[PDB]
């Protein structure tokens, strides 16, 4: 006696019991109700568009400092302001204010990095294989 029915004709209860208990899982609940993407940083998207508001570390005396590579960006989808990392100060250059930037998941609290500016990859500009259209 394991606290469960075992009769050969008790298939019904085992199913009904299983369906009820399956809702206990958070993973099962999120998958069925489609609320798993609330927790995602971009609300289910793989990348985030934004506007460059300011370059916080532009002044910072120390080259290639963690502050220098941070840029404040406002997400277009919701308008919430966040920070993004830039690969390096040279890449901090191609970014200028009011440019469109595509963001991707990555000083603590900065969880985003810039992968495109003005519709072109930052690495492409950094390797200098392309030129930013304005």
């Amino acid at each position: 006696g394991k606290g469960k029915p075992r009769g050969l004709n008790s298939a019904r209860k085992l199913r009904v019991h299983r369906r009820n208990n399956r809702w206990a899982e958070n993973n099962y609940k999120k998958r069925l109700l489609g609320t798993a993407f609330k927790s995602s940083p971009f609300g289910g998207s793989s990348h985030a568009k934004g506007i460059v508001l300011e370059k916080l570390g532009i002044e910072s005396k120390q080259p290639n400092s963690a502050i220098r590579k941070c840029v404040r960006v406002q997400l277009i989808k919701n308008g919430k302001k966040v920070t993004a990392f830039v690969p390096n100060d040279g890449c901090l250059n191609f970014v200028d204010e009011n440019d469109e930037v595509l963001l991707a998941g990555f000083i603590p609290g900065v969880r985003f990095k810039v992968v495109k500016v003005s519709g072109v990859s930052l690495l492409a500009l950094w390797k200098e294989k392309k030129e930013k259209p304005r």
Partner: peptide
């Protein structure tokens, strides 16, 4: 590693005055 090769160029010592 986002440093270009040019950024790591060798810097040569100034020669002493003749």
């Amino acid at each position: 590693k986002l440093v270009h090769d040019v950024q790591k160029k060798q810097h040569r010592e100034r020669s002493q005055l003749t």
